[PDB]
Design a protein around this ligand. Structure first.
Ligand SMILES: CC(C)(O/N=C(\C(=O)N[C@H](C(=O)O)[C@@H]1NC(C(=O)O)=C(C[n+]2ccccc2)CS1)c1csc(N)n1)C(=O)O
Ligand SMILES: [Cl-]
Ligand SMILES: [Cl-]
Ligand SMILES: [Cl-]
Lengths: 242, 242
């Protein structure tokens, strides 16, 4: 059901990188990874948590829709794109933590915890501050657990409205052309070792869907592009994209 | 409110073609075109009619969701991509007329006419075969009328459910990257002169949306790629995309 293919390690070593790519063929219900152990090791979700956080905020009415404007609070942060107004689409695109921190406060701990349990999301532990726990609190998730969660989102099976799931899938849109559509979310965990990068989501084809979840050691910001590049080398090797 | 910019004609004449591009800046509520008259000239919608047809089929339950499979009827036809099973996503991508003819028959004349009147769509005239009138019946629509219809869809303001509009807009997804998202639909009017190609939809930016509608003289199928290419040259010239 899970098969290992150490061939992919070549795309990590070409950049003296280390990590795991997990793929799931939805038609055949078969998984593939370069590293079975690391595929099941849990890490901080970091900004991949904006997927569940969006769903809860939308379902509770904290976010009205994908056009609602969340005004910059006027405090300059050292990510330039955060110091402006955002909606859900742009907050996800630029991983605008302060917008999502405000969502999480309005959601509150009790509603956050029960939604994550209903989602079966990671260790479902929101130990810590409600507005930081996906960064430095108690929550952890593995690449295979990301796949399982994303599969439920793809099929509208999570315990939120169908509308909530459709809107988050819209906001996950990353790339599209006549060959594939990628809906996904990046993440970068920095507060505690090991510093890792995430890319999770799926590739939609005419006749199949390939779910994916990858994380990699990320000692500095200078390699963040490798999350997508290495994932794409594996997708190409497996003939999922040209 | 409307500006004529005949400088865009250079892109048409380069390919010894003729046509019109119409653009609408949603934030500024301002419109632009190379040919005010042809902007208002009504043509067969041809396969751009798959936009309202999709909406109607979804809102009436004729199409349950974007995953329902409409089986190929076994009759081999000249466009290979049509000779295969489809859902709403792939039927729109490959403009699979026979699938949408089935929709139209199930919708029926009465409900089709009522819907297009509720939509204020073109000249609202479905005279002819209930399953061919957008290609050889009485219906006609201009570029400016396409924009007016598309703006209502974008805003979920048409008189069908939000869900129906969300699903159609998902099916219209054509291109997406880090700079823009294009949701659009092509068309080729080939049954009754004059032979014309259509491309209509919108470009989503971080902080604005630019609606577009273009048609061009299209004597042979070999020029069809000009529809998107001339549109993008205009989009590039107006600095809307890089
Ligand atoms: C029939 C044929 C040749 O092509 N069939 C097509 C098709 O692609 N038709 C072309 C079209 O839509 O541009 C032309 N239709 C017209 C036109 O209808 O005016 C004539 C002239 N013509 C007249 C009567 C019957 C067929 C063709 C020539 S084919 C089609 C569309 S939807 C559907 N359910 N089939 C095939 O592949 O077997
Ligand atoms: Cl026909
Ligand atoms: Cl979408
Ligand atoms: Cl077409």
């Amino acid at each position: 059901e899970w098969q290992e293919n150490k061939s992919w390690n070549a795309h990590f070593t070409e950049h003296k990188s280390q990590g795991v790519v997990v793929l799931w063929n939805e038609n055949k219900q078969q998984g593939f990874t370069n590293n079975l152990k690391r595929a099941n090791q849990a890490f901080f979700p970091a900004s991949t948590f904006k997927i569940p956080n969006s769903l809860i905020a939308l379902d509770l009415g904290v976010v009205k829709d994908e056009h609602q404007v969340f005004k910059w609070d006027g405090q300059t942060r050292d990510i330039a794109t955060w110091n402006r107004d955002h909606n859900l689409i742009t907050a996800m695109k630029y991983s605008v933590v302060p917008v999502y921190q405000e969502f999480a406060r309005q959601i509150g701990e009790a509603r956050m915890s029960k939604m994550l349990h209903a989602f079966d999301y990671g260790n479902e532990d929101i130990s810590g501050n409600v507005d930081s726990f996906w960064l430095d609190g108690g929550i952890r998730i593995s690449a295979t657990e990301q796949i399982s969660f994303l599969r439920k989102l793809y099929h509208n099976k999570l315990h939120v409205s169908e509308r909530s799931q459709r809107i988050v899938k819209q906001a996950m849109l990353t790339e599209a052309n006549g060959d594939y559509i990628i809906r996904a979310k990046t993440g970068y965990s920095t507060r505690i070792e090991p510093k890792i990068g995430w890319w999770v989501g799926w590739v939609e084809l005419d006749d199949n869907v390939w779910f994916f979840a990858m994380n990699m050691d990320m000692p500095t910001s200078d390699g963040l592009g490798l999350r997508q590049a290495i994932t794409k080398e594996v997708l190409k090797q497996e003939k999922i994209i040209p």
